Amino acid sequence: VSGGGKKPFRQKGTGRARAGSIRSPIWVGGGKTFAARPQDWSQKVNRKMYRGAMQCILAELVRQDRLVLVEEFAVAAPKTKELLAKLNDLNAARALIVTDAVDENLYLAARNLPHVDVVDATAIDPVSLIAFDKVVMSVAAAKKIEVELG
Amino acid sequence: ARVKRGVVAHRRHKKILARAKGYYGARSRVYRVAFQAVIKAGQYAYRDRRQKKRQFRALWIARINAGARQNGLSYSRMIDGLKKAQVIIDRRVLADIAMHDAVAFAALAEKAKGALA
RNA sequence: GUCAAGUAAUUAAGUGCAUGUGGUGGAUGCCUUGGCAGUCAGAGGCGAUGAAAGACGUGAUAGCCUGCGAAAAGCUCCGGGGAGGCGGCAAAUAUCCUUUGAUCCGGAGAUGUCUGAAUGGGGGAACCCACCUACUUUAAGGUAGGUAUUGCAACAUGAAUACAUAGUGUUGCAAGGCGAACGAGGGGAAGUGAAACAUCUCAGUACCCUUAGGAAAAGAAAUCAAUUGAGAUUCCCUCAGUAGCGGCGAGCGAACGGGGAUCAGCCCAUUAAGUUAUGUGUGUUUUAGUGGAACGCUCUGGGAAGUGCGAACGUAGAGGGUGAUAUUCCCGUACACGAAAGGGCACACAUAAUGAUGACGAGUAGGGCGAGGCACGUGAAACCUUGUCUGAAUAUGGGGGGACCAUCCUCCAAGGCUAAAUACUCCUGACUGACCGAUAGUGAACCAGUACCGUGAGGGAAAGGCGAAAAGAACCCCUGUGAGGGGAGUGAAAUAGAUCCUGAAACCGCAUGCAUACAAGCAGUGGGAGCACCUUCGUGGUGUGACUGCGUACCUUUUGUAUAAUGGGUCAGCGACUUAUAUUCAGUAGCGAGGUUAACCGUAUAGGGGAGCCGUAGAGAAAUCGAGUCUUAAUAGGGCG
RNA sequence: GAACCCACUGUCGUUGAAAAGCCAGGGGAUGACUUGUGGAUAGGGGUGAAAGGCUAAUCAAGCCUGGUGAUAGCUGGUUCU
RNA sequence: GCUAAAACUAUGUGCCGAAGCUGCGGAUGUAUACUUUGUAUACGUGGUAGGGGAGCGUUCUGUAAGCCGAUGAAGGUGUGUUGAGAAGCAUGCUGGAGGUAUCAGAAGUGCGAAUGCUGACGUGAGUAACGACAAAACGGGUGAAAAACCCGUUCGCCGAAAGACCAAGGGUUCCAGUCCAACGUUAAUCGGGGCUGGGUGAGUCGACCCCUAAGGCGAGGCCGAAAGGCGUAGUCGAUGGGA
RNA sequence: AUAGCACUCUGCAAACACGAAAGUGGACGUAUAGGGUGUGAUGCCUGCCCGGUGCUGGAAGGUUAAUUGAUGGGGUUAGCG
RNA sequence: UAAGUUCCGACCUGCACGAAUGGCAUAAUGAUGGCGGCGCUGUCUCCAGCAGAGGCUCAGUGAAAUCGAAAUCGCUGUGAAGAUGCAGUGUACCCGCGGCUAGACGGAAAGACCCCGUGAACCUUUACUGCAGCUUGACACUGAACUUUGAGGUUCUAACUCUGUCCCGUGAUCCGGGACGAGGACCGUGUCUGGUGGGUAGUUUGACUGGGGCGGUCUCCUCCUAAAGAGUAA
RNA sequence: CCACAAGUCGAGCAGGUACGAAAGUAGGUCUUAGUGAUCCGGUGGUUCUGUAUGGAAGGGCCAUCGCUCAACGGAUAAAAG
RNA sequence: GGGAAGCCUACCUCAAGAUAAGAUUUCCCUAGGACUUUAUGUCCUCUAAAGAGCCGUUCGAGACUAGGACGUUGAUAGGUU
């Protein structure tokens, strides 16, 4: 805190409580007692623990019937209405789409839709697998995830 | 995550001051004095819940003594006579009858002295 | 009817409690043209062509702020844009300007007073006094240019003193000052710890001084290693709190090897890589900008974006605003375009200049004496630097391998240049936050480094909120043509009425109900009559509390406190076991005789990376052995396993 | 013995008219005198007819800013059930 | 207050008396058996320094483009009600735009004390004091109002200063008109207060200028790790000389 | 503090003081001068002690530093066994 | 003096005067210390009256320190041992104003006396340990020629000195260069080295203890205290 | 026996001894005081280590020496008012 | 029975807040309605006594108070004689 270098008044004789600096944390406008610094909040996750958690998540999705498999999922043109109708056909209006590779047209069509996101098979994450209502996965992406074993 | 204390602190102080209603001077206005006054009131109430039983038993005994001496007995002799007569009516009911029904108390005293004889 | 004795009701000067209604005060809640911390990408300087920082002026009105400079809220040109505008506090007013294109935005020019390195001399900064040229005027002036010091170069001149040299002058070129952090170098503490203190520590830290660059420094082995192998610097992870150093105290603390980031070498006189300027060409980037989709009805309401019912766009559902909460009202967003003129960067050629006074390294290596640096405190002390005194050999030569000798291995000092990986943030643009929301966050959200204090260096505040819109209250009344208020009017709201959202507490009034003027103390508590209001008419509710049993605050510190031991006048707000790293134990999860990666790469929480760490074997000081091992002459005995 | 320069005694004042005074008396008053303006000496230093006096109402080591959040086996305080 | 006691000695029969024991209702800890149970039984539940266990509330992140809200959020103020507690829930009035379940996650997470810090406000108390004991009185005027302002008539005080000037220092306090909230230790129509407008005229007065003292700076120079010290030629510097 | 007195140092580039040095004061002075120390007008005066500490002057015996490096004892290996 | 621990003069067993840290005197001088007298008085016996300024009342303005909260009596006792607040008892209707200072261990300043902390500062010295200053010798700057018994003596100039004279830069008591003169291998300086060194600096200077200091003690063995096992303090 | 660091008693086994004819006795003295940790150094020994290798220097291990560290669990090698 | 400057009286002053609030003398007030909370009842109209005070002139009374005297039917104060 700015200033505060000198002793405000003498140690004895004034009848005041003894003070060493005007920026003492007891004083209004003084320093904070335990001043914070920038922190790193990352944790270590064991490789096997991460893989096992992802396997558990995928299995639980399967047995709760939130994973929907499709032979192919593509859009002819980058049209939000096209993607919306395609999803409304499968009854997956709120969904995370997983494909083996992300087509530019599909990504553009999905960008503006609320509750819809499209990711690569190698970019799935545990929070996004749980947050969305349904996960629509192509067979090629499912095979790639099988090879990776979650 | 800075936390401001005002709402909760105000609620606690207000509850203490509400419990201190009716006290004299700073005891119903000033938080420190009022807080000292509420704790002491609780301490007194805890002690007096025990004192009350003794005080009321003493009152019953005094009234029974007056009735017995009206009927020609002392309290101790009347209690002994009732014990020997097997009557197990307690002092609360005995004092109630002594105050409100002289004929019934006279009958009870007669039973006691008959057992004494 | 009189008298007597006994015994009810009736007072409030004032006070207590409860409730109602106010004042003061500015807490709380909600909010923010303010702060705090970062990421990515730039940039890393300004200055004698006069800087940073200032003084004084400049307006139709002109106090402060902002801009500007006697050409003075501006002048010229080029480009954009298309209906308002004459900067803000800060409304009104006038004169006005503008589709013959204003205000405004970008680029380039013109002007640019005085002080300040301040440089014609001086000086108490913003002032005083000058000289010399050229032109101009006739009076007592004007215009433009020049006049500092030091260093270097050329020219000229020139003593003691003969030649010279010193000295002197002119011209040309250059430098000085300021400013964040990082770099390099010259000097260099003490508080503290060691539970005292001197060796030691703190610590080459704080501080003082000199001086660069976008980075700097270092750098191409007279280096390590020890299967004869590696192969210049710099930075990160390990090795490892190991080997060692140490009043062998407190403490200090490597290297070898391995894994990564980045990779690069080139020369000593015919002279290299590289670097810096100027010009040309090409590419890219940057300084204004243009277009940019799609909503209606109904209900509540002061106001619709909110309810109910249907519809449309989406490569646009980022964000902001609009009278409450909007993809479709406005500004925008995705996307598609755009530049007279200027700047930055990258590559290629051209010319300069540098590298580059240096050609294999002598007052050098080594030594005696005293110090300093190495993790290493004189130690068994190698190696580096040198204040002092000395002093080689010079490729059949010389340095190192931690006293020293021999043998082996390895390098060639006394000459140089060199990018990247590394360090930082005064500043510019974009974006972000389990960062703050006016006692917080910068000292400063507000005309703050101000007011104020001090001779001075220096220290250093407080202070945000009417309303959607001023629609900021015409007019009437009391009053001193005051202050203040009551009506009226505006507004959804005026107890939103100007220090105006909300409006707490301490503290201070008025009104009503009950109690209180014969009675002694922490002020309550357990009982309990009466009265007033209400009432489900009661074995009920609210307020009060005659009379009565018991009862000496709280905290701290103590053997022990009502203590006449400490602390607190009261309220509101703030105020004290945290953060990083290492280690041990316990829970819990994964895997399991195995477990696990670090730096780093990675459009990146994934996936790679096995160097390293822990466990799996002990004994011994150690060499050594090993389910054994140490001690011993011992297979005895005994200790650790 | 006036001005001027001092400060021996007493009352008052002591939240003062005043962070050192007023009043009544008192000493020196051509001298080692008093005084204006402008200068010099700077902190383990200065200056001192010497009291550890004075050095900006501060002196057995001035003031300011830094080391610095010095250390304190001591005192105090330490917040809901 | 007590005397064949209400004293002392001995004996007897009753009674009073604690949060001890018993009775009735409720909570909680440990163990045995019921071979989940949440059930019965038995034994426990005063506590400082300490150790262990279990929770309530506050701010922020996700869940949350969800849920509540102008038919009224947060905050403020009452009332009722619920639990063993920290606390929860409902609602009247005020208020005028936000609030947030559940389950996880992170802390600027809880104040009465530290002669704690900042602001506001009490008690003392309408108490002390209103600053030289040179001194005032009356008539008239203006004004809302006159002991204090103006005019007049008296009285008193200073007169080597309590008068008149200059330098230093200050900076508009100078003059006129107008105003009285704040400032003036009272009121004020008055003012060194607010606002508006005026006012400082030099060859001879002073400064500037010429000259130098103490002292300062100092081309070259001497000295010093650096910063710097001293000093020559000079150049400044009045408190002095020059119409 | 003082005039007066005494002791002692100082031959001038003085002793002494300031300073890191350059240099400056002493002093544009020269032993009838300058510094340090004690005493304190004036009158009468100022006794005894050199063992201690200090100062001044001798003596060259004993002890002692850097420097110097005579001797003795080890390490290493050509060679000899 | 009626009465003299003070004063003056004298005496001398001077606890513990004494001759320039001066001895004994001494005119004048001193807001200097002690004693006595005249005059004078409210200093006093012993206070009275009067004058001014406050105090008191009215109008206006308007502080202070303190403060846990107060429905804030006496006495005797009790009790962290000196009570408004506890016990017993006595007295006492409610509230101001002018006075007063016996108590509220009254207010004021985290006691300065005393002790403690392995606190501080400054001062002293024959405390410890450094350093400045001063001084000694060796080596370097540092040379030459003649003598004597490693050292000594005489002479010289060319290193070096001059806060001596003259000349020039130059309008100059600095400085530099030149010429003289006087010195001269001395003096002086650098490195190393012995001595001196409260001038200056950093520090140390124990504990127990019927307060601390002074005294005593501090480790080991035997007996008693020691209460018939062990252990057990001053 | 005991906080630790320390201290005390000890049958018995092996080797080498002394005295006894022998069974046997002897690991100092009737016993309980006669003492000092760690660090740093000196001496003797050593089938340990030895910074490229062979040595060596130095270090380790075994035995032993240097304390009124007596404030006797000993804060420094070195300290009064 | 006697018996002290001592105790209770006796002497002086105060004294019924002596809440047990005492005593005596003298003086003053003798009206109507409505209603229900049917009683020292609550509201209207009428009535305002004996006295006390405010105010004024004042005091041998006094800080302010309180107390004493007087207020035209008058000597309370000033003036006048």
Ligand SMILES: NCCC[C@H](N)CC(=O)NCCC[C@H](N)CC(=O)NCCC[C@H](N)CC(=O)N[C@@H]1[C@H](O)[C@@H](OC(N)=O)[C@@H](CO)O[C@H]1NC1=N[C@@H]2C(=O)NC[C@@H](O)[C@H]2N1
């Ligand atoms: N039934 C009863 C009837 C009784 C009878 N009728 C009697 C009666 O009725 N008497 C009335 C008396 C009332 C009172 N005495 C009068 C009074 O007070 N006049 C005040 C007159 C001057 C006033 N001071 C000026 C003023 O307001 N400056 C502010 C100020 O610079 C600043 O504000 C704050 N905060 O810093 C600024 C910031 O915005 O804003 C300004 N202002 C702005 N306004 C603007 C706005 O709205 N939008 C746009 C922008 O222009 C805004 N800025």
